[PDB]
Amino acid sequence: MGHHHHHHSHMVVIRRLPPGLTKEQLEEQLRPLPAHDYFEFFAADLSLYPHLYSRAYINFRNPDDILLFRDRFDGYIFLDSKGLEYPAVVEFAPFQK
DSSP: OOOOOOOOOOOEEEEOOOSOSOHHHHTTTTSOOSSEEEOOOOOOOSSSOOSOOOOOEEEESOHHHHHHHHHHSTTEEEEOTTOOEEEEEEEEOOOOO
């Protein structure tokens, strides 16, 4: 009995998220990864936003999966119905054992 020893899963977070879209339309681009996991995603109404700021958190299974999506999603513009530019920046989360 033992384990196959899998590569270490490092945590990742997203930056520059203004209140507009809800997790349903928000996580679609935050967790479309192959081998990964996912955390709490915030909610918001574009029809007069709830004022406050909230941050989404991403979790992985493979460090290779990281550099894959981390490079392509590094500061990309997602557009809402109103034309709301979401400049989503993916980076490495402050690691805590």
